[PDB]
Design a protein around this ligand. Structure first.
Ligand SMILES: [Cu+2]
Ligand SMILES: [Cu+2]
Ligand SMILES: [Cu+2]
Ligand SMILES: [Cu+2]
Ligand SMILES: [Cu+2]
Ligand SMILES: [Cu+2]
Lengths: 333, 333, 333
């Protein structure tokens, strides 16, 4: 059918780890879903030490926002590069088919905009990221990535084919940064992106991130910004890593149903302690909370988690179940 | 039902790579299974060069012992930290639900003990490890980890749902160590754990292990300590890595049935040459031996295996099958 | 049945990324399939800078050629080490059962040859590589690896069990090289392999490849050597990595059906954006092209791809489908 005859819906995106409102089960026929993103190059403090990088972002955040559509919707993205930016940007959707995921069609200089449309033919969670020719890993590792979820029109199903409905959804973007270091091991400082470039490339070539963070900074998903849930709630956590492998783990819980490589026509893996999301992939894990308290959600390379930053918290409210776990004899001499 | 009305069984653990006696198919109803572990901080020689580290262990071994129970048993662990130790320890079971896997409830100073109980609600092999707040990766990477296997009550099944019975079981714990190095590349030496700590953290932050070993040392599963089997025997190998990805491979064999991420409600992967066990996970592979001789079981990053230590041997006895493999023309000029 | 009563077929191998002619569906009963490979130690230029290594190859190429047989054929390999070589070589097939995959039976000094036969009992794609005792990772990381595909006798099937037929097949071997570097970071140069050895080992122990390439060199699968297809063609790409994990991704496409760990008795993963092939494994991905243009096929650690070399191109001819993707508003001020 002619695309002009389809309904259109405009979505306004929200900042991760939150996700724009949507329906799991498609309440309309196929639609054109309209999104707008504004590129912002900005300074960001990424750690407790106050290390500050020139970040490249979709819509002001690292990661970029989670977009949500249904299988066989059309995604129409208006991408704006304001004149206050210095660099050329584009966008590649792993969800899309052709033209380097859209990257060949979306090259915008500062002061320019473009509109891309693609059909979301495959259900799953997918990475999107910037990919300007000659400079891809630098943009991606400066924060310019996010994800898109293409739900099956009848929502998610378990390994047997019965409905799985989530009560809450969170989006964790994990970012590897590669801040250049001198012979002494201190982080170098740079006046312009072009003066940063070769040292950025050299730092990348070590394949050793200096920082690995959730939602753009060490401790971004802790304290007042901890994720929350209640006992008995079904939570979907979507987790992306555009460049580097990760292995999410909910300390004190499990992934009840996991799409480790994120594609919903496959049956989920059950009862996972830890699952591997390859670099360049988004995955999704569904868990029903059974106990209250603080949970840590970590990359289970524990060095990456507790020294380099890849750790956040859930604060869970509800009833303690002494059947599931109890202290029989509290620590004592 | 009230837990006090359940049978109780005490298990005495054995040193890896061996596994305490158990039944694959549950011969009783749900039980409380009682385990005791004693923490021992000790010096360990980890390589042929005589490099010696201050190891932190459950029950005197790296890895800690494999515990085996059935789905919906209760695990009751008595954890003892004797006054001869210097550090605070606890335990996190990935098999358990709540309170950071038990870690929030099991903090023991030297001279103290504690008893934790949890219900083993999910069948699979699972990592356990020490996780004291502020210091997790150091304890884990100093050897303080093991695994627990929660068997389905009717034992293991193949991809079709028919019984798979193992004749022998072995437990391979793979340990990444990060021994601090100076500018020249020699291994530094330290008087106390507190004086070691920052250099330990710096060494960890390289993300480059200095040693990757099976059962606590280079060559621990070779020679007189080679694993053994006979042609026609069905062997289960449980393999854990608490911190870092590994990729087991049996040189000369296969994984006939593999749970790469270790969870028994999923059908096994068949005919694997090599399988990926993510950091923070335990996996299980079942193989029926068809040829005699020496087999090497390795992490198939071959640098990790043959230079850094992640290699052991099987010595297999029985009949050579010339149908499966033969030398047609022996090496000659 | 006696092996001498089986038909014999001689195959002459072709240079990757191309694959010798074969039938997907077995047109004969079980056969002995005869292959010959000649070891060649040669100088190779591996990057745009003109960095030159002493490569060790099967049949003059990195990777070695893809061999193709059917389940329960016998593979008979004649391996020739000419007197112009300096080193001892052998071969280990992950497809074979016993004697370290053949490695214990195939040790050939320069001026010697050997013939090994094994039964291909398990369907899948499998790595083969050199594995001389005491020196395995050096040989493997100097290029001495390839793959073998053992097709099911009735060819490939989808997740439901219906036929999947490919129109073209390509073989991508991904090679991690570890060229030794001085304190300044320049690549060292060596007079003989024995003088190279310790520095090779030291470079390997960093676990940081200096180069990660497809088909033996940066840009080997670009330009005039780009892979090709037409819209609507079903392409199988076989991808191996003998030593190190990789995560293939077709920029602008997908893996419609993927065997990430390469073993055909398992159902394929559907609609993958990126898939993890563990070190020591071969995988296979099937894609039907739906759009024309240039596609990049990359390791989706984008540093590994765009800085260290792990990137090639597909040039695809055919009709552009504006339904699947279109530029609505071309980049403009
Ligand atoms: Cu950009
Ligand atoms: Cu990408
Ligand atoms: Cu401890
Ligand atoms: Cu853990
Ligand atoms: Cu060789
Ligand atoms: Cu191998």
């Amino acid at each position: 059918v002619d695309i002009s005859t389809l309904p259109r819906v405009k979505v306004d995106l929200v900042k991760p780890p939150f996700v724009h409102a949507h329906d799991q089960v498609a309440k309309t026929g196929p639609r054109v879903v309209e999104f707008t993103m504004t590129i912002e190059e900005k300074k960001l403090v990424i750690d407790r030490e106050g290390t500050e990088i020139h970040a490249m972002t979709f819509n002001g955040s690292v990661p970029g926002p989670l977009m949500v559509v249904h299988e066989n919707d059309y995604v129409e993205l208006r991408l704006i590069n304001p004149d206050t930016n210095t660099l050329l940007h584009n966008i590649d959707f792993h969800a899309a088919t052709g033209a380097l995921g859209g990257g060949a069609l979306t090259q915008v200089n500062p002061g320019e905009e473009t509109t891309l449309r693609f059909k979301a033919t495959k259900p799953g969670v997918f990475v999107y990221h910037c990919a300007p020719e000659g400079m891809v890993p630098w943009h991606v590792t400066s924060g310019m990535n996010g994800a898109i979820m293409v739900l099956p029109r009848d929502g998610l199903k378990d390994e047997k084919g019965q409905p799985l409905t989530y009560d809450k959804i969170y989006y964790v973007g994990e970012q590897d940064f590669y801040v250049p270091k001198d012979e002494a091991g201190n982080y170098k400082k740079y006046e312009t992106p072009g003066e940063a470039y070769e040292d950025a490339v050299k730092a990348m070539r070590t394949l050793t991130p200096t920082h690995i963070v959730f939602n753009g900074a060490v401790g971004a998903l802790t304290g007042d910004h901890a994720l929350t849930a209640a006992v008995g709630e079904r939570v979907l956590v979507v987790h992306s890593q555009a460049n580097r492998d990760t292995r999410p783990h909910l300390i004190g819980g499990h992934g009840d149903y996991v799409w480790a490589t994120g594609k919903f026509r496959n049956p989920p893996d059950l009862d996972q302690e830890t699952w591997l999301i390859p670099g360049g992939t988004a995955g999704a894990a569904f868990y029903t909370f059974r106990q209250p308290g603080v949970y840590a959600y970590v990359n289970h390379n524990l060095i990456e988690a507790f020294e380099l930053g890849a750790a956040g918290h859930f604060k869970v409210t509800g009833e303690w179940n002494d059947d599931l776990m109890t202290s029989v004899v509290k620590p004592a001499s």
